[PDB]
Amino acid sequence: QVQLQESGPGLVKPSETLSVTCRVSGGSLDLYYWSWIRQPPGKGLQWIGFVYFDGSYGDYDPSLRSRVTISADMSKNQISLRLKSVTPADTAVYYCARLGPGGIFDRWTGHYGDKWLDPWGQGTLVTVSSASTKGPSVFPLAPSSKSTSGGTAALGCLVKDYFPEPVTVSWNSGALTSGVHTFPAVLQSSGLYSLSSVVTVPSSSLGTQTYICNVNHKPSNTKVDKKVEP
Amino acid sequence: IDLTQSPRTLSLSAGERATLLCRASQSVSNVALAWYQHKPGQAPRLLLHEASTRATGIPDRFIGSGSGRDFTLTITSLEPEDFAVYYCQLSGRRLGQGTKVEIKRTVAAPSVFIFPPSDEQLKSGTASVVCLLNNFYPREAKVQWKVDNALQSGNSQESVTEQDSKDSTYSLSSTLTLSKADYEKHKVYACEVTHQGLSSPVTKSFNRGE
């Protein structure tokens, strides 16, 4: 029943030090390794490193070892990854997971459990930029008669000109999930992410059910709701 | 010591058998190999460890085998739910480039809608026209922006969804963003869509003022 979640700064500036913290929420660190895995914007799962729970033994990817140190506070049940001298290369989602074979405990000689990665947990995005955050400007994608196609209508919200990722879009405060496509952000040449989010709903429900999107942008403490009307 | 997966990409109709290879640079014992399914936006999950021992709770259709340096993830019968990228790794946990697995399915034509620029966005000095391609397959499609029957470039920008885990279709959004000054020197903003499932391309358009 173990479970874990990473978290950290939403942004880091060039040449600074990036840190991210993972909190084990179903058991203790006892007799396991804890590892960090990054996924850059276009790539696969780059492994970064792991550390024994008690902190005596660790192994890292030698590309990063000079600028990486991983520590675990067995008491706080949290693990810290510390990557020095960050560049936009390090811009990535950082995953946290639990190494292996049952772990089992080992002396200083032979650290010869390590086998699999179980729970992983969403992990967190860290953009890395000298830019400063900006808030979404949320507009309606109105289901006009050019969005009336027989008995089904389409409608949505436009979430434009923000930074950095992510934003959260929800429909009618979580109530509406069917027919939702919240598109991927598209990084414009301005440096800003932009995104629509659409829902298709029955034409009959347009005058009975109101439709409001719930945009959320924690990097700017922006939360807006926008009604969609003709 | 390294790890080589192949194919990098694999498009198979739902219900057919899929075979995935992970090839070591060297001899390795069964124990240190494991397989991971990474659906987009979820967290990566263990499928198999020690090369054959199924992870707790993951279905029977995932089977793992091998020795030496050729390791093999087998999906006996693909379910649309299997759209993902499947990775493998060694003990101290470094690697796998993965295998993006589509679910090939029937041609499905996109449903198209356009949305005019909002009254609110026009007040800020920028107009955005959004064109929608909804629940279609195969992935590839063509959006052509036509403004009074003239083509656009460089100020249209588009995004497409990850493959729907239940009917394996794709949805696409092409957003045309112009300044209000530009938006008003034309009258009819039209979006033309070309796709396999469409007999001839479709165009949905409005005249500025509606």
Author numbering:
A (entry chain A): 1 to 52, 52A, 53 to 82, 82A, 82B, 82C, 83 to 100, 100A, ...
B (entry chain B): 2 to 27, 27A, 28 to 210
Task: Provide the authors' own sentences about this structure as they appear in the paper.
The HIV-1 envelope glycoprotein (Env) is the only potential target for NAbs on the surface of the virus (Burton and Hangartner, 2016, Kwong and Mascola, 2018, Wibmer et al., 2015). Env is a trimeric spike composed of gp120/gp41 heterodimers that has evolved a plethora of immune escape mechanisms to evade antibody recognition. We identified SF12 and related bNAbs with up to 62% neutralization breadth from an HIV-infected donor. SF12 recognized a glycan-dominated epitope on Env’s silent face and was potent against clade AE viruses, which are poorly covered by V3-glycan bNAbs.
To characterize the binding mechanism of the new antibodies, we determined the 3.1 Å crystal of the unbound SF12 Fab and a 3.3 Å cryo-EM structure SF12 Fab bound to the clade B B41 Env trimer. The members of the clone utilized VH4-59∗01 and VK3-20∗01 heavy and light chain variable gene segments and included CDRH3s and CDRL3s of 23 and 6 amino acids, respectively. VH gene segment mutation frequencies ranged from 17%–25% of nucleotides (21%–39% amino acids), and VK gene segment mutation frequencies ranged from 15%–21% of nucleotides (20%–29% amino acids), intermediate rates of SHM for HIV-1 bNAbs. In addition, SF12 shows an intermediate rate of SHM compared with other HIV-1 bNAbs, with 21 and 19 amino acid substitutions in the heavy and light chains, respectively. Moreover, SF12 uses a long CDRH3 of 23 residues and a relatively short CDRL3 of 6 residues, while VRC-PG05 uses a moderately long 17-residue CDRH3 and an average 8-residue CDRL3. In addition to being isolated from two different donors, SF12 and VRC-PG05 arose from highly divergent VH (VH4-59∗01 versus VH3-7∗01) and VK genes (VK3-20∗01 versus VK4-1∗01) (Lefranc et al., 2009). (C) Superposition of VH-VL domains (235 Cα atoms) of unliganded SF12 (orange), Env-bound SF12 (magenta), and core gp120-bound VRC-PG05 (green) Fabs, showing differences in CDR conformations between SF12 and VRC-PG05. We conclude that the SF antibody family achieves substantial anti-HIV-1 neutralization with an intermediate degree of somatic hypermutation and no evidence for autoreactivity.
